[PDB]
Amino acid sequence: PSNATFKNKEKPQEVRKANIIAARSVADAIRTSLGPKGMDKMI
């Protein structure tokens, strides 16, 4: 299986990637405001 079936377009691979990144970013802003020793945010 040297030749295989070549996956042509890459935008798929690098869209998902950067989406999870743009999302973990939000799930990160929150980590400070979890549980009893969590902290409040002023918007």
Ligand X SMILES: Nc1ncnc2c1ncn2[C@@H]1O[C@H](COP(=O)(O)OP(=O)(O)O)[C@@H](O)[C@H]1O
User: How many chain residues are in contact with other proteins, going by CB under 8 A?
Assistant: 13
Minimum distance between the CB of residue 43 and ligand X, rounded to whole angstroms?
16
DSSP state for residue 3 in the 8-state scheme: S
- Taking CB atoms, the residue at the shortest distance from ligand X is 35
Q: Does 34 bind other proteins (CB under 8 A)?
A: no
CA proximity to 31, closest of 19, 41, 22: 41
Q: Quick one: tokens of 39?
A: 């902290």
Out of 10, 26, 36, 40, point to the residue binding ligand X (CB under 6 A): 36
Q: Does 13 bind other proteins (CB under 8 A)?
A: no
Residues in the chain: 43
Q: Which residue has the tokens 């950067």?
A: 18
